Structure formats: structure tokens, C-alpha cells
CSV table of C-alpha atoms and ligand atoms in Angstrom, one decimal:
chain,number,residue,atom,x,y,z
A,1,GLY,CA,-186.7,-93.3,66.5
A,2,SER,CA,-182.7,-93.1,67.8
A,3,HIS,CA,-180.7,-93.1,70.5
A,4,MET,CA,-178.1,-91.1,69.4
A,5,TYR,CA,-178.6,-88.2,71.9
A,6,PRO,CA,-179.3,-84.8,69.4
A,7,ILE,CA,-177.5,-81.6,70.7
A,8,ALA,CA,-174.3,-80.5,72.2
A,9,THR,CA,-173.2,-82.9,75.3
A,10,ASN,CA,-172.8,-79.2,77.5
A,11,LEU,CA,-174.5,-76.1,76.4
A,12,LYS,CA,-172.9,-73.2,77.3
A,13,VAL,CA,-174.0,-69.5,77.7
A,14,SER,CA,-171.5,-67.8,75.8
A,15,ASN,CA,-170.6,-65.1,73.3
A,16,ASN,CA,-173.0,-65.3,69.7
A,17,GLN,CA,-170.9,-66.3,67.6
A,18,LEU,CA,-171.8,-68.5,64.5
A,19,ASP,CA,-169.1,-71.4,62.5
A,20,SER,CA,-172.2,-72.1,60.0
A,21,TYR,CA,-174.1,-71.8,57.3
A,22,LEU,CA,-173.7,-67.9,56.5
A,23,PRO,CA,-171.1,-67.1,54.1
A,24,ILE,CA,-170.5,-64.2,55.9
A,25,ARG,CA,-169.5,-62.4,59.0
A,26,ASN,CA,-170.2,-59.1,60.9
A,27,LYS,CA,-166.0,-58.2,58.9
A,28,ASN,CA,-164.0,-59.1,56.8
A,29,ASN,CA,-166.4,-60.2,54.0
A,30,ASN,CA,-163.5,-58.7,51.2
A,31,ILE,CA,-164.7,-61.8,48.6
A,32,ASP,CA,-162.9,-62.7,45.4
A,33,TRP,CA,-165.2,-64.2,43.2
A,34,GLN,CA,-162.1,-65.6,40.7
A,35,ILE,CA,-160.9,-67.8,43.6
A,36,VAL,CA,-164.0,-68.8,45.0
A,37,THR,CA,-164.6,-70.2,41.9
A,38,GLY,CA,-161.3,-71.4,41.1
A,39,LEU,CA,-162.7,-73.5,44.0
A,40,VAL,CA,-165.9,-74.9,43.0
A,41,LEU,CA,-164.3,-75.8,40.1
A,42,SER,CA,-161.4,-77.6,42.3
A,43,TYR,CA,-164.0,-78.9,44.6
A,44,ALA,CA,-165.6,-80.5,41.9
A,45,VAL,CA,-162.9,-82.5,40.1
A,46,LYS,CA,-160.7,-83.2,42.9
A,47,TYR,CA,-157.5,-81.5,41.5
A,48,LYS,CA,-155.8,-78.9,43.0
A,49,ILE,CA,-152.6,-76.4,41.7
A,50,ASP,CA,-149.5,-76.0,44.2
A,51,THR,CA,-147.7,-72.8,44.4
A,52,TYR,CA,-147.5,-71.9,40.2
A,53,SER,CA,-149.3,-69.4,38.1
A,54,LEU,CA,-150.9,-69.5,34.7
A,55,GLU,CA,-148.1,-67.0,33.5
A,56,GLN,CA,-145.1,-69.6,34.5
A,57,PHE,CA,-147.6,-72.4,32.8
A,58,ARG,CA,-147.9,-70.7,30.2
A,59,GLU,CA,-144.3,-70.3,28.8
A,60,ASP,CA,-143.4,-74.0,30.6
A,61,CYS,CA,-146.2,-74.8,27.7
A,62,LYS,CA,-144.3,-72.3,25.4
A,63,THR,CA,-141.4,-74.4,26.0
A,64,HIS,CA,-142.9,-78.3,26.2
A,65,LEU,CA,-144.0,-77.2,22.8
A,66,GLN,CA,-140.8,-77.0,21.1
A,67,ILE,CA,-139.1,-79.8,23.0
A,68,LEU,CA,-141.4,-81.7,21.2
A,69,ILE,CA,-141.1,-79.8,17.8
A,70,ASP,CA,-138.8,-76.4,17.4
A,71,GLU,CA,-140.0,-75.4,14.4
A,72,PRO,CA,-139.2,-71.5,14.1
A,73,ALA,CA,-142.4,-70.7,12.8
A,74,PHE,CA,-145.0,-72.9,14.9
A,75,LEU,CA,-143.1,-71.7,17.7
A,76,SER,CA,-144.2,-67.9,16.8
A,77,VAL,CA,-147.9,-69.3,15.8
A,78,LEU,CA,-148.7,-70.8,19.2
A,79,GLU,CA,-147.2,-67.8,20.3
A,80,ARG,CA,-149.9,-66.2,18.7
A,81,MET,CA,-152.7,-68.5,19.2
A,82,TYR,CA,-152.2,-68.2,22.4
A,83,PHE,CA,-151.0,-64.5,23.5
A,84,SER,CA,-154.6,-64.0,25.3
A,85,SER,CA,-155.3,-65.9,28.3
A,86,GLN,CA,-159.0,-66.1,27.2
A,87,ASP,CA,-158.0,-68.7,24.8
A,88,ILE,CA,-156.7,-71.1,26.9
A,89,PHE,CA,-159.3,-70.8,29.4
A,90,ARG,CA,-161.1,-71.7,26.4
A,91,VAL,CA,-159.2,-75.5,25.7
A,92,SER,CA,-160.6,-76.4,29.4
A,93,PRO,CA,-162.2,-74.6,32.3
A,94,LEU,CA,-159.9,-76.4,34.3
A,95,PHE,CA,-157.2,-73.9,33.8
A,96,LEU,CA,-159.6,-71.7,36.6
A,97,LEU,CA,-157.8,-74.1,38.9
A,98,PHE,CA,-155.4,-71.1,38.8
A,99,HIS,CA,-157.6,-68.7,40.3
A,100,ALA,CA,-157.6,-70.5,43.5
A,101,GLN,CA,-153.9,-71.4,44.4
A,102,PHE,CA,-153.1,-73.8,47.5
A,103,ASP,CA,-150.3,-74.2,49.3
A,104,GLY,CA,-149.9,-77.4,50.5
A,105,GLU,CA,-153.2,-78.4,52.8
A,106,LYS,CA,-153.9,-74.1,52.8
A,107,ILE,CA,-155.5,-71.9,50.3
A,108,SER,CA,-153.0,-69.9,49.4
A,109,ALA,CA,-154.3,-66.3,48.6
A,110,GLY,CA,-157.7,-66.5,49.7
A,111,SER,CA,-159.5,-64.5,52.6
A,112,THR,CA,-161.1,-66.1,54.9
A,113,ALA,CA,-165.0,-65.2,53.7
A,114,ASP,CA,-163.2,-66.6,50.4
A,115,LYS,CA,-163.3,-70.2,52.1
A,116,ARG,CA,-166.6,-69.1,53.3
A,117,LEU,CA,-168.0,-69.0,50.3
A,118,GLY,CA,-166.3,-71.9,49.3
A,119,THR,CA,-167.4,-73.7,52.2
A,120,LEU,CA,-171.6,-72.8,51.1
A,121,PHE,CA,-170.6,-74.3,47.6
A,122,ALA,CA,-168.9,-77.5,49.0
A,123,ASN,CA,-171.9,-78.7,50.7
A,124,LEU,CA,-174.2,-78.0,47.7
A,125,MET,CA,-172.0,-80.8,46.3
A,126,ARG,CA,-172.2,-83.5,48.3
A,127,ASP,CA,-171.5,-86.5,46.3
A,128,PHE,CA,-171.3,-84.8,43.6
A,129,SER,CA,-168.4,-85.3,40.2
A,130,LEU,CA,-167.6,-83.8,37.4
A,131,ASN,CA,-166.2,-85.5,34.4
A,132,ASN,CA,-163.4,-83.2,33.1
A,133,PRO,CA,-165.5,-80.6,30.7
A,134,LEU,CA,-160.5,-81.4,22.1
A,135,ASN,CA,-158.4,-80.9,19.2
A,136,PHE,CA,-154.9,-81.7,19.2
A,137,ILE,CA,-153.1,-79.2,20.1
A,138,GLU,CA,-155.4,-78.7,22.6
A,139,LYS,CA,-155.0,-82.4,24.4
A,140,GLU,CA,-151.5,-82.0,24.1
A,141,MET,CA,-152.0,-78.6,26.7
A,142,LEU,CA,-154.6,-80.6,29.2
A,143,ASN,CA,-152.0,-83.4,28.7
A,144,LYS,CA,-149.0,-80.8,30.4
A,145,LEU,CA,-151.8,-79.5,32.8
A,146,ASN,CA,-152.2,-82.8,34.4
A,147,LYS,CA,-149.2,-83.6,34.6
A,148,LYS,CA,-149.3,-80.2,36.9
A,149,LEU,CA,-152.6,-81.4,38.6
A,150,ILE,CA,-152.3,-82.5,42.4
A,151,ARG,CA,-155.1,-84.2,44.2
A,152,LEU,CA,-157.7,-83.0,46.8
A,153,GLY,CA,-158.2,-85.4,49.0
A,154,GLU,CA,-161.2,-83.5,51.6
A,155,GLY,CA,-160.1,-80.3,51.1
A,156,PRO,CA,-159.9,-77.5,53.1
A,157,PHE,CA,-163.6,-76.9,53.5
A,158,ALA,CA,-166.3,-77.8,56.6
A,159,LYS,CA,-168.9,-80.5,56.1
A,160,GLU,CA,-172.2,-79.0,56.8
A,161,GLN,CA,-175.2,-81.0,56.2
A,162,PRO,CA,-177.7,-79.0,53.8
A,163,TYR,CA,-180.0,-76.8,54.9
A,164,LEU,CA,-181.7,-75.9,51.8
A,165,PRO,CA,-182.0,-79.9,50.1
A,166,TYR,CA,-184.4,-77.9,46.9
A,167,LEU,CA,-181.4,-75.2,46.1
A,168,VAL,CA,-178.6,-78.9,46.2
A,169,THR,CA,-180.8,-80.0,43.3
A,170,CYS,CA,-180.7,-77.4,41.5
A,171,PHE,CA,-177.1,-76.2,42.1
A,172,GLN,CA,-175.7,-80.0,40.7
A,173,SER,CA,-178.2,-80.1,37.7
A,174,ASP,CA,-176.7,-76.1,36.6
A,175,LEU,CA,-173.3,-76.5,37.6
A,176,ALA,CA,-173.9,-80.1,35.0
A,177,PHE,CA,-175.3,-77.4,32.4
A,178,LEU,CA,-172.5,-75.9,32.3
A,179,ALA,CA,-169.9,-78.6,32.3
A,180,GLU,CA,-171.8,-79.8,29.1
A,181,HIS,CA,-171.3,-76.4,28.1
A,182,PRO,CA,-167.7,-75.2,28.8
A,183,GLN,CA,-167.8,-71.8,26.6
A,184,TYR,CA,-170.9,-71.0,28.3
A,185,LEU,CA,-169.3,-72.6,32.3
A,186,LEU,CA,-167.0,-69.5,31.6
A,187,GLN,CA,-168.8,-66.7,30.8
A,188,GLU,CA,-171.0,-67.3,33.8
A,189,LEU,CA,-169.6,-70.3,36.8
A,190,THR,CA,-168.9,-66.8,38.6
A,191,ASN,CA,-172.3,-65.1,37.7
A,192,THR,CA,-173.9,-68.6,38.6
A,193,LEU,CA,-172.0,-68.9,42.1
A,194,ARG,CA,-173.4,-65.2,42.6
A,195,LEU,CA,-176.6,-66.2,42.3
A,196,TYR,CA,-176.6,-69.0,43.9
A,197,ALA,CA,-175.2,-67.4,46.8
A,198,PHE,CA,-177.2,-64.3,47.3
A,199,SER,CA,-180.5,-67.3,47.1
A,200,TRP,CA,-179.1,-69.6,49.2
A,201,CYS,CA,-178.8,-66.4,52.0
A,202,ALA,CA,-182.5,-65.1,51.1
A,203,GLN,CA,-184.2,-68.8,50.8
A,204,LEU,CA,-182.4,-69.1,54.2
A,205,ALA,CA,-183.9,-66.4,55.6
A,206,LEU,CA,-187.1,-66.7,54.8
A,207,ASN,CA,-187.1,-70.6,56.5
A,208,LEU,CA,-185.4,-69.4,59.5
A,209,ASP,CA,-189.1,-69.6,61.4
A,210,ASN,CA,-190.2,-72.7,59.7
A,211,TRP,CA,-187.4,-75.8,62.4
A,212,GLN,CA,-190.7,-77.4,63.3
A,213,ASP,CA,-191.8,-78.7,59.3
A,214,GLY,CA,-189.0,-80.6,58.7
A,215,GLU,CA,-187.4,-80.2,55.3
A,216,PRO,CA,-187.9,-77.1,53.8
A,217,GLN,CA,-189.2,-75.8,50.3
A,218,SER,CA,-188.9,-72.7,48.0
A,219,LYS,CA,-190.2,-69.9,49.6
A,220,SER,CA,-192.3,-67.0,47.5
A,221,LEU,CA,-190.2,-64.5,47.2
A,222,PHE,CA,-191.3,-61.7,45.4
A,223,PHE,CA,-188.4,-59.7,42.0
A,224,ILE,CA,-189.1,-57.4,39.6
A,225,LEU,CA,-187.5,-56.7,36.6
A,226,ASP,CA,-184.6,-53.9,36.7
A,227,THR,CA,-186.6,-52.5,33.8
A,228,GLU,CA,-189.9,-51.7,35.4
A,229,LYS,CA,-191.4,-49.0,38.0
A,230,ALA,CA,-193.5,-50.4,39.8
A,231,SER,CA,-195.5,-47.3,40.4
A,232,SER,CA,-198.8,-49.5,40.4
A,233,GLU,CA,-199.7,-51.3,43.6
A,234,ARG,CA,-199.0,-54.7,43.5
A,235,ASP,CA,-199.5,-56.7,46.5
A,236,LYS,CA,-196.8,-59.6,46.0
A,237,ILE,CA,-194.0,-56.9,45.8
A,238,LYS,CA,-194.8,-55.3,48.9
A,239,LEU,CA,-196.0,-58.5,51.1
A,240,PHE,CA,-193.4,-60.9,50.0
A,241,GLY,CA,-190.4,-58.5,48.3
A,242,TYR,CA,-187.9,-56.4,50.1
A,243,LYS,CA,-189.4,-56.2,53.2
A,244,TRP,CA,-190.1,-59.3,53.6
A,245,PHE,CA,-186.4,-60.4,53.0
A,246,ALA,CA,-184.9,-57.3,55.2
A,247,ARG,CA,-186.8,-58.7,58.0
A,248,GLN,CA,-186.0,-62.3,57.8
A,249,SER,CA,-182.5,-60.9,57.1
A,250,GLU,CA,-182.8,-59.7,60.4
A,251,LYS,CA,-182.8,-62.9,62.6
A,252,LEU,CA,-179.8,-64.5,60.4
A,253,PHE,CA,-177.4,-63.9,63.0
A,254,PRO,CA,-179.6,-64.3,65.9
A,255,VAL,CA,-181.3,-67.5,65.1
A,256,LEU,CA,-178.3,-69.3,63.3
A,257,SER,CA,-176.0,-67.9,66.2
A,258,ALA,CA,-178.7,-69.9,68.7
A,259,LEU,CA,-178.3,-72.9,66.5
A,260,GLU,CA,-174.4,-72.9,66.8
A,261,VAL,CA,-175.1,-73.8,70.8
A,262,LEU,CA,-176.7,-77.5,69.9
A,263,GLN,CA,-173.8,-78.2,67.6
A,264,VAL,CA,-172.6,-81.6,68.5
A,265,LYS,CA,-169.0,-81.8,68.9
A,266,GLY,CA,-167.4,-83.9,66.7
A,267,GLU,CA,-170.0,-84.1,64.1
A,268,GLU,CA,-171.3,-82.7,60.7
A,269,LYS,CA,-173.2,-79.5,61.6
A,270,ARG,CA,-177.1,-80.2,60.9
A,271,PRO,CA,-179.9,-77.0,60.5
A,272,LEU,CA,-182.1,-76.4,63.1
A,273,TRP,CA,-185.4,-78.1,61.7
A,274,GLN,CA,-182.9,-81.8,61.5
A,275,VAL,CA,-181.8,-80.9,64.7
A,276,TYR,CA,-185.6,-80.3,65.5
A,277,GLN,CA,-186.7,-83.3,64.2
A,278,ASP,CA,-183.4,-85.4,65.9
A,279,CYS,CA,-185.2,-84.2,69.1
A,280,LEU,CA,-188.5,-85.2,68.7
A,281,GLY,CA,-187.8,-88.6,67.8
A,282,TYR,CA,-184.7,-89.4,70.3
A,283,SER,CA,-186.6,-91.5,72.9
A,284,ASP,CA,-185.7,-90.2,76.7
A,285,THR,CA,-187.9,-91.5,79.4
A,286,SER,CA,-186.0,-88.7,81.3
A,287,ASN,CA,-186.6,-85.6,79.6
A,288,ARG,CA,-183.2,-84.8,79.3
A,289,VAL,CA,-182.8,-82.8,76.3
A,290,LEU,CA,-185.8,-80.6,78.0
A,291,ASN,CA,-184.4,-79.8,80.8
A,292,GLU,CA,-180.9,-79.4,79.0
A,293,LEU,CA,-182.3,-76.9,76.9
A,294,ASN,CA,-184.6,-75.3,79.9
A,295,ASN,CA,-181.3,-74.5,82.3
A,296,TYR,CA,-179.7,-73.4,79.5
A,297,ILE,CA,-182.7,-70.6,78.5
A,298,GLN,CA,-183.3,-70.2,82.1
A,299,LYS,CA,-179.6,-69.2,82.8
A,300,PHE,CA,-179.2,-67.1,79.3
A,301,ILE,CA,-182.1,-64.8,80.6
A,302,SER,CA,-180.3,-63.7,84.0
A,303,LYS,CA,-179.4,-60.8,85.9
A,304,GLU,CA,-176.1,-61.9,85.6
A,305,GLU,CA,-176.1,-63.4,82.0
A,306,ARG,CA,-178.8,-61.6,79.1
A,307,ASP,CA,-180.8,-59.7,81.8
A,308,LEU,CA,-184.4,-61.0,80.2
A,309,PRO,CA,-187.6,-61.1,80.4
A,310,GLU,CA,-188.5,-64.0,83.1
A,311,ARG,CA,-190.5,-66.6,82.0
A,312,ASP,CA,-191.7,-70.2,83.0
A,313,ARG,CA,-190.3,-73.3,82.1
A,314,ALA,CA,-191.0,-75.0,79.2
A,315,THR,CA,-193.1,-78.1,78.9
A,316,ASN,CA,-192.6,-79.5,75.8
A,317,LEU,CA,-189.6,-78.9,72.5
A,318,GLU,CA,-191.8,-77.7,70.6
A,319,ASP,CA,-192.1,-74.8,73.2
A,320,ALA,CA,-188.9,-75.1,74.2
A,321,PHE,CA,-187.5,-74.1,71.2
A,322,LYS,CA,-189.9,-71.3,70.7
A,323,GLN,CA,-188.4,-70.2,73.9
A,324,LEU,CA,-184.7,-70.6,72.7
A,325,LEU,CA,-185.8,-68.8,69.2
A,326,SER,CA,-187.0,-66.2,71.3
A,327,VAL,CA,-184.6,-65.0,73.4
A,328,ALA,CA,-181.8,-65.2,70.8
A,329,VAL,CA,-183.9,-62.2,69.2
A,330,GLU,CA,-184.2,-60.5,72.2
A,331,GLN,CA,-181.6,-59.8,73.2
A,332,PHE,CA,-180.8,-57.9,70.2
A,333,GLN,CA,-184.0,-55.7,70.4
A,334,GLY,CA,-183.5,-51.6,72.2
A,335,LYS,CA,-181.6,-49.8,68.9
A,336,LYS,CA,-179.3,-48.3,71.6
A,337,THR,CA,-177.3,-51.5,72.9
A,338,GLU,CA,-174.1,-53.0,71.6
A,339,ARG,CA,-175.5,-56.1,70.3
A,340,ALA,CA,-177.8,-54.6,68.0
A,341,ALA,CA,-175.0,-52.9,66.3
A,342,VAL,CA,-173.6,-56.3,65.3
A,343,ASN,CA,-176.9,-57.3,63.9
A,344,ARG,CA,-177.0,-54.2,61.7
A,345,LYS,CA,-173.2,-54.8,60.5
A,346,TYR,CA,-174.4,-58.8,59.7
A,347,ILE,CA,-177.4,-56.7,57.4
A,348,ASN,CA,-175.2,-54.4,56.1
A,349,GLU,CA,-172.2,-56.8,54.8
A,350,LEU,CA,-175.1,-58.8,53.7
A,351,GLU,CA,-176.8,-56.2,51.9
A,352,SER,CA,-172.9,-54.9,50.5
A,353,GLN,CA,-171.0,-58.4,49.4
A,354,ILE,CA,-174.2,-60.6,48.8
A,355,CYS,CA,-176.8,-58.7,47.5
A,356,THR,CA,-175.7,-56.8,44.4
A,357,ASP,CA,-177.6,-55.5,42.0
A,358,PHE,CA,-180.4,-57.4,43.4
A,359,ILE,CA,-181.6,-54.2,45.1
A,360,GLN,CA,-182.5,-51.2,43.5
A,361,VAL,CA,-184.1,-47.5,44.9
A,362,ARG,CA,-188.1,-47.1,43.5
A,363,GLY,CA,-188.6,-43.5,44.9
A,364,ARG,CA,-190.7,-43.4,47.8
A,365,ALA,CA,-191.4,-47.0,47.7
A,366,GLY,CA,-188.3,-47.2,48.7
A,367,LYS,CA,-185.5,-50.7,48.3
A,368,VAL,CA,-186.4,-52.8,46.0
A,369,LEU,CA,-185.8,-56.4,45.1
A,370,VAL,CA,-184.7,-56.4,41.2
A,371,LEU,CA,-183.7,-59.2,38.5
A,372,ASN,CA,-181.4,-57.8,35.9
A,373,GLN,CA,-180.9,-58.5,32.8
A,374,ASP,CA,-178.2,-60.5,33.4
A,375,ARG,CA,-179.2,-62.9,35.2
A,376,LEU,CA,-182.6,-63.5,34.0
A,377,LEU,CA,-181.0,-64.9,31.1
A,378,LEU,CA,-178.5,-66.5,33.1
A,379,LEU,CA,-181.9,-68.0,35.1
A,380,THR,CA,-183.5,-68.4,31.6
A,381,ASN,CA,-180.8,-70.8,30.3
A,382,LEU,CA,-179.6,-72.3,33.4
A,383,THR,CA,-183.7,-73.6,33.7
A,384,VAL,CA,-184.4,-74.1,30.1
A,385,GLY,CA,-181.0,-76.2,30.7
A,386,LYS,CA,-180.8,-79.5,28.3
A,387,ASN,CA,-184.0,-79.4,27.1
A,388,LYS,CA,-184.2,-77.6,23.9
A,389,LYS,CA,-187.7,-75.9,25.4
A,390,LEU,CA,-190.3,-75.0,28.1
A,391,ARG,CA,-193.3,-74.3,28.3
A,392,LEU,CA,-193.5,-70.9,30.3
A,393,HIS,CA,-195.0,-71.9,33.2
A,394,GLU,CA,-192.7,-74.7,33.1
A,395,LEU,CA,-190.0,-71.9,33.1
A,396,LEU,CA,-191.3,-70.3,35.8
A,397,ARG,CA,-191.3,-73.0,38.3
A,398,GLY,CA,-187.7,-73.6,37.6
A,399,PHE,CA,-187.1,-69.7,38.0
A,400,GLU,CA,-189.1,-70.6,41.8
A,401,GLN,CA,-186.9,-73.9,42.7
A,402,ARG,CA,-184.2,-71.4,43.0
A,403,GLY,CA,-185.6,-68.5,45.0
A,404,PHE,CA,-186.9,-66.2,42.3
A,405,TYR,CA,-190.9,-65.4,42.2
A,406,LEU,CA,-192.4,-63.4,39.2
A,407,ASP,CA,-196.2,-61.9,39.9
A,408,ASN,CA,-198.6,-61.6,36.6
A,409,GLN,CA,-197.2,-58.8,35.5
A,410,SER,CA,-193.3,-59.6,35.9
A,411,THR,CA,-194.3,-62.5,33.6
A,412,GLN,CA,-195.7,-60.2,31.2
A,413,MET,CA,-192.6,-58.3,31.0
A,414,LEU,CA,-190.6,-61.0,30.9
A,415,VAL,CA,-192.3,-62.8,27.6
A,416,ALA,CA,-191.6,-59.0,26.2
A,417,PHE,CA,-188.2,-59.2,27.0
A,418,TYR,CA,-188.1,-62.7,24.9
A,419,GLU,CA,-189.3,-61.0,22.3
A,420,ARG,CA,-186.6,-58.8,22.0
A,421,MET,CA,-183.8,-61.5,22.6
A,422,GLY,CA,-185.8,-64.0,19.7
A,423,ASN,CA,-186.0,-66.2,22.2
A,424,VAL,CA,-190.0,-67.1,22.1
A,425,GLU,CA,-192.5,-68.6,20.3
A,426,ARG,CA,-195.5,-66.2,21.3
A,427,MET,CA,-196.6,-63.2,17.9
A,428,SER,CA,-194.9,-65.2,15.2
A,429,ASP,CA,-197.5,-68.3,15.2
A,430,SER,CA,-200.5,-69.7,16.7
A,431,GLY,CA,-200.1,-72.2,19.4
A,432,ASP,CA,-201.0,-74.2,22.0
A,433,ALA,CA,-197.9,-72.8,24.7
A,434,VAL,CA,-195.7,-69.7,24.8
A,435,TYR,CA,-192.5,-71.4,24.7
A,436,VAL,CA,-188.8,-70.6,26.1
A,437,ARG,CA,-186.1,-71.3,24.8
A,438,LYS,CA,-182.4,-70.9,25.7
A,439,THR,CA,-180.3,-67.9,24.1
A,440,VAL,CA,-177.2,-69.8,23.9
G,1,NA,NA1,-198.8,-66.7,19.4
């Protein structure tokens, strides 16, 4: 197939590190979600604002308008019309750019976690653009704003080939839908990002082991509505819920840091399933790749290095990768070790900063994955989207595409929730299907 050598030309047995894909590290995960939101919009429209506050824009806008008019009554009214900043934001979500202040090419106030999340979403937005999301006063305000907007250029984020292409499609549809509804964009863009950040990390964890199968698809992760007791014995929740997520989450840092070893310098990063595929299609008569991996693995498990059980070299590429991923995990076994502590911090950070209110306690049943009512409404609106109406099964398939699965019982409770919310065709007529519409 190819003749591009598929992995790093020099494979160092080094300290575990990742520079890609996961948006959290073992510490320093203080996230400014409004900055992240500003960064996302900036990358969507290819503009930024440089060291210039919304406070100052507001003042400059008043001033700008009284240069054009200067009627004492008029000033007093615009003062009142735009005293509340929500009324500036409502004119255009371009105003969210003020949250992501740049200083030259640098993100002025972001933590490095903000930049990491910015990077996740920029790689869900490859080859994606928003057309800028109006009465006569508002148009003058956007005219003043356009004078402040600086072109983004390539921007500050790293390029990473999409690990989960199915979330890309969904994310881009959802951003496009929000852009058509600017008032709803303001209410929900940020929550949409928290939702995607979680689902992306969960779906990643659940697809790590599927590196043999090429391009991944949505994996069954089951959530209850936060309103449910979860007292009866539900198989899907037990087998494919929190405990499945938690088991697979334990491999994020191990597997992704190993993948980091293979990544070719001076090239866009790519996911493990792409790297494997590239290794299979590379025609090397001399088995260069297989030999390099075996050398690395054998050096990895050596006593001077990680000190792991001896094993015969891999005779093929499939078995070489499995070996790489075993040892990648094996080094974190034994609760006592220092590396097992690092992996634990990864889990706690993930659960604290990314999984907020996706997890709850349910008595003796321990932790449980939940969808709270806000997220449920957000999903409903995103999924119905540009449609007037979806059949219930159509809706659930949308939810599933985005990483959210529901058993039959949760689906009953969902429909009941929609009756109260008044966005379902259910008991009030006799129809061919259950139809769900947007609440917005
Ligand atoms: Na009915």
C-alpha cells in the first residue's frame, strides 16, 4: 500500500508522557469554560480579539455612537439598552470572543488545560467554518466590532488526526445548529462543550482496545436519567455503565502515552488505529517495523528499564502491538508502585474536571452514570436539531451516536419526562409513532 515509514524513526524507552488527545494531565486541570468557549468560537469564525476588554468595548461603543449623533436623550437610552451585558451578547455570539483574549499569537489568560480543550475542539472542527451567526442599531455595533477583530491565521492549537470521526460529524452538525439559533447558542454552547468533552473522553476510553478494527464507531455506554432509583437489576447499567467506563478509563494514560512513543516527528498526530493500519499497509520486505517494535519492547521490559516478565519476540505486527499495549499497562500494576499513583491522579482529575454531574452515587450500587435534566434537554434539542420532529427511535440513535445509550426502562422515563415538558406526541392522539420535538 504505502511507502511512508509508519512510526517514529527512533523509539526511545523514556518517561511516560502524552502530548495529545486527552485534554487532562495528572495535575493543572483548572478549566475556564468561558475561555474555552471563546476559543471555540474564535476557531469557528477565524477571528480573535487582542488585549481589549468587553468593558472597554462597551465604553468605546457608547462614545462611537455619540460621535455619530450626540443627542442627550439617545445616549441615555443606549446606556439603558445595553447596561446589561447579556444584551450585547444577544446581538451576536461573536461577543464571546472577548472571553478568549489573545496577546499576539498567545492566549492571554488561558491555563494550559484551556489550551488542551481548545485543541480537542479544534480537531473536531477541521475544514469547518461558521458563517457569522439584525436591526439597524445592532448592525452599527457589529460594524464597530469588526474593526476590532483580528484574523486568526492557523491559530494556537496542535493538529491531531481525529480519534473518533463519528463525534466530529455530530459536533459539526450541533455547532451548525446552534449558530442558526444564536439565543440558544448563548444559553448552551458552553454546556455543549462540557457534554462533548466528557463523551469524547468516555468514547475514547471505550475504543482504545479496538485498534485492530480501523475507524471506530460509537460504543455502548449506558446512562440512567438522574431521576431514576436504579434499584432493580438492570443488566445494561451493570455491564456497560459506570464500571465499564471506569475499567477502560484506567487505560487512557497508559495506552495514549505508549502511542506517543510511535508518533512521527514533524507530522500531524494520529490515533493508534490509524498507526496500526499504516503499519499493515507499509510494504517492507525486510520487516523493519516489526524489528524496531520488538527492540523497543525488549528494552522496555528489561531490568535496567521497567523490569517486567520476559517474553518471546513478536513474530507478526498484530502480536507486536498487543505486546506493546500489555507492557504499557503492566508497568502500572501493583498498587504500591509510584507509577500507579500517577494513573490514579489521571482518573481523579478526569472524574472531577470532565465528568461533572455525569456521575452519582446510588447506595450499595456505588457510582452510576447519569444524564441530568439540563443535558437531557440539550441532547434532545441538538438531536432533533434542524428537524421539526423525530420519531423516538430516530432520537435515540442520535443520542447513541453522541455516546449516550438508554435501556428500555430509561426510555420510558424519558418519554414521561417529555409529557411534562410538553414536547412529545404521546397520549393526546393515536398515531403511527411517538414523536419528539424541540423544547426550544
Ligand atoms: Na397515543
